Structure 1
Amino acid sequence: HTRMFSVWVNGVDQGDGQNVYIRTPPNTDPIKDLASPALACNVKGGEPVPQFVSASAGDKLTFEWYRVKRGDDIIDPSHSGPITTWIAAFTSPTMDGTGPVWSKIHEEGYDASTKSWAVDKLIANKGMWDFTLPSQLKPGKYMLRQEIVAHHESDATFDKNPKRGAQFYPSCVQVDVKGVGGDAVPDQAFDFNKGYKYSDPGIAFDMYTDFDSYPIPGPPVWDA
């Protein structure tokens, strides 16, 4: 259990984002049903918030996460798994992030050298998660989506044991991308309800064995 507090732009906190520029769900509960409309932007994903983060293409962004209170333990260390970041054009305000619209822009999963997960790193860096807005990206509004997947109970699938299964923690942020950017339009058009399946070995994943690597679900990072 976890959710986002604010976004930082080149190391500058834009201030509490919850129901401002983040589509903040009412609590920290996980999505587990891969058929749920909420898989994409969580439980209030379809409700506009009034603001957009201001950034230029190429800018470094930091997503800041918390569990109960800002600056706390962030998420339970049991909750090992990867952290992926996505982009989609802002089609209309009542978009909810369903359909074939997403391109993946960053991922960290399992680092075998350190035996460290993305989540272990999120914790040790106090809920701060960094990535870059592609410098080639075309100026305009987009939704960013960033997702912690936790695998403490991914050793079964939800469809077989509803009391278990992988847990998805998606956060969608509204961003007005300015500066020069380039001509890149995100064009992987990945659909989460279609594209995440119980058969994916990055979902049906047993973290309680001697494993050497973790296959992160979805396409590779957008070639930009």
Structure 2
Amino acid sequence: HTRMFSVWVNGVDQGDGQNVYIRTPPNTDPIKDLASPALACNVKGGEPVPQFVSASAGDKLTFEWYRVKRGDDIIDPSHSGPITTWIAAFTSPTMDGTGPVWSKIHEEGYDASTKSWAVDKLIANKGMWDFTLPSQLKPGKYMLRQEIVAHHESDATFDKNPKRGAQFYPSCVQVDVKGVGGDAVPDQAFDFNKGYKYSDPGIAFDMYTDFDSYPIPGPPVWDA
């Protein structure tokens, strides 16, 4: 249970973005049903918010998370797992991020050297999660999506035991990208409802074993 407070551009807080440039869900509840339309942008994914984060291709974005109040414990430490960041064209205001539209731009899973998950690092860094917009990105409006997946109950799948299963915490953010000479259009065209499956070893995952690797769902980070 966690959601976003605000976005920072090159270390500058843009200010409370909830229902401003973030499509904020009404609460911190997870999505579990891989068939749910809310898997992409959460329960209010389809409702436009009025503002777009102003950023340039190449900029460092920080997404700030919290649990109950800004600056708190961010997420219960039981909720180990990966954090992935995606981008899609902003097709129209009432897009909900369903369909074959996404490209992965950043990921962290499990680091065997430090036995540390992305979620451990999120907590240690007070809910600040950093990534770069590709400098080649063609200028225009995009939806950015950042997802925390918690695996504390992933040792069963939702289709078999609906009380358990992977927990997805997606957050979609509206961004208006200034170009720096790039022409690249993200083209993985990944579709969460089709591409995430209960058979996926990174979804049907037992975090309570000796493993030293975690397979992050979806394609590798988009290139060129």
Q: Which category of TM-score, normalised to the shorter sequence, fits these structures?
A: over 0.9
Q: How many residues align?
A: 224
Alignment check: 8 A CA contact 1:30 1:169 kept: yes
Report the aligned-residue RMSD.
Answer: 0.5
Structure 1 gap ranges (5+): none
State percent identity of aligned pairs. 100
- Distance change in 2, residues 1:181/1:75 (3 Å): farther
TM-score (norm. length: structure 2): 0.99
5 Å matches for 1:27-42?
27-42=27-42
Alignment check: 8 A CA contact 1:111 1:213 kept: yes
Shift in Å, 1:180: 2.1
Alignment check: 8 A CA contact 2:202 2:215 kept: yes
Shift in Å, 1:27: 0.1
Structure 2 gap ranges (5+): none
Q: Which runs of 4+ in 1 moved over 6 A?
A: none
Shift in Å, 1:181: 4.0
SS in structure 1 opposite 2:47? Answer: coil
Separation in 1, partners of 2:203, 2:181: 35
Alignment check: 8 A CA contact 1:137 1:184 kept: yes
Alignment check: 8 A CA contact 1:58 1:181 kept: no
Shift in Å, 1:70: 0.2
Separation in 2, partners of 1:209, 1:64: 30
Alignment check: 8 A CA contact 1:147 1:171 kept: yes
Alignment check: 8 A CA contact 2:87 2:186 kept: yes
Shift in Å, 1:212: 1.0
Deviations 1:83-121 (A, max 9, x none): 000000000000000000000000000000000000000
SS in structure 2 opposite 1:63? Answer: strand
Deviations 1:67-95 (A, max 9, x none): 00000000000000000000000000000
Alignment check: 8 A CA contact 2:138 2:179 kept: no
Separation in 1, partners of 2:92, 2:51: 14
Alignment check: 8 A CA contact 1:56 1:181 kept: no
SS in structure 2 opposite 1:168? Answer: strand
Which deviates more from structure 2 when the two are superposed, residues 105-114 or residues 179-188? Answer: 179-188
SS in structure 1 opposite 2:43? Answer: coil
